[PDB]
Design a protein around this ligand. Structure first.
Ligand SMILES: Cn1nc(C(N)=O)c2ccccc21
Ligand SMILES: [Zn+2]
Length: 140
């Protein structure tokens, strides 16, 4: 579980989005597992714009922030989980590290701020959904 609070926008895993998220929707994408909803207050998190392939993510199923090297945002295949079956997901960066399904929402961060959130993985791999290619999050 976890969200990005960038201004009056809550960024969540689409598969973990609440009735309130859909009742106050902005943008969503099934192939990216990303949903942005509206908020009644500006947030405490800033977004990264960069091509960094290193940072740190929160792994809830360890209560640890792990340093990680991670791929650039691109197309990958995922295996069956509690939410989705074995499918492909886009704009998804991968790294070596522990992730279960419940680790989704945990933030990934580089020097430039928030890179994205846990969304995918398996077999000592963790997959992050990129929010760096969503520049509109900073404004409006
Ligand atoms: C981080 N993570 N997200 C999923 C998913 N949404 O299917 C997954 C599945 C297996 C292992 C790790 C995983
Ligand atoms: Zn950075």
């Amino acid at each position: 579980s976890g969200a990005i609070y960038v201004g009056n926008y809550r960024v969540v895993n689409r598969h973990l989005a609440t009735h309130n998220d859909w009742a106050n929707l902005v943008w969503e994408d099934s192939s990216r597992d990303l949903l942005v909803s509206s908020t009644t207050a500006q947030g405490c998190d800033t977004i990264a714009r960069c091509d960094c392939q290193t940072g740190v993510y929160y792994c809830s199923s360890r209560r640890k922030h792990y340093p990680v090297s991670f791929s650039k945002p691109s197309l990958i295949f995922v295996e069956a989980s509690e939410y989705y079956p074995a499918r492909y997901q886009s704009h998804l960066m991968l790294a070596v590290g522990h992730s279960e399904p419940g680790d989704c929402g945990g933030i990934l961060r580089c020097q430039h701020g928030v890179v994205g959130i846990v969304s995918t993985g398996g077999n000592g791999l963790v997959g992050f959904a990129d929010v760096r290619d969503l520049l509109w999050l900073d404004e409006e």
